[PDB]
Write a protein that binds this ligand. Structure first.
Ligand SMILES: Cc1ccccc1-c1cccc2c(CCCOc3cccc4ccccc34)c(C(=O)O)n(CCN3CCOCC3)c12
Length: 155
């Protein structure tokens, strides 16, 4: 889906870019902006927690990947599908994919590979929308993501 890819890329690239730079993007959101803004807010809350709680595993995975240049970033796509396409599909695994994406984006800045952040964001969005299309549609896309992590109103 064109609209699902577009919205997912906007959310994912905004999170990875602001995690690496330390500064939010003031540029307005495109189509379905209200959902995208709520999704980015949820991603910041949940995603920052995932990076803190799974720091040892994220450091371990980053070391195994041994990312040194732009060719290594292009090959990340096949490692992503090997790990992500094996087993169950849920929002927890999706937030892990994106959160590790931000952890990798920060490392990319450190090694002067900031130009690889946007192709990284596109690769993550590609793996997500291409492999989990049907599941994402059944779960109401990004509205479903926001609702899933919304627990303060359970009573
Ligand atoms: C949290 C955890 C705990 C214990 C060990 C590893 C992890 C762990 C670490 C990192 C990411 C994930 C994912 C996201 C998908 C891969 O993301 C990428 C892979 C490769 C490159 C990527 C690049 C950019 C963005 C995502 C990339 C999952 C997941 O799919 O849940 N896990 C758990 C992995 N399981 C462990 C048991 O063995 C079965 C697999 C991950």
């Amino acid at each position: 889906s064109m609209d699902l890819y577009r919205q997912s890329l906007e959310i994912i690239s905004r999170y990875l870019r602001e995690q690496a730079t330390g500064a939010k993007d003031t540029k307005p959101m495109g189509r379905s902006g209200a959902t995208s803004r709520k999704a980015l807010e949820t991603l910041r809350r949940v995603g920052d927690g995932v990076q803190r709680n799974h720091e040892t595993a994220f450091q371990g995975m980053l070391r195994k990947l041994d990312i040194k240049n732009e060719d290594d970033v292009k090959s990340l796509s096949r490692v992503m599908i090997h790990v992500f396409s094996d087993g169950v599909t849920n929002w927890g695994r999706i937030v892990t994919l994106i959160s590790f994406g931000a952890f990798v984006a920060k490392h990319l800045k450190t090694i002067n590979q900031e130009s690889c952040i946007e192709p990284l964001a596109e690769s993550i969005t590609d793996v997500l929308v291409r492999t989990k299309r049907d599941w994402l549609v059944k779960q109401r896309g990004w509205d479903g993501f926001v609702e899933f992590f919304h627990v303060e109103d359970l009573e």
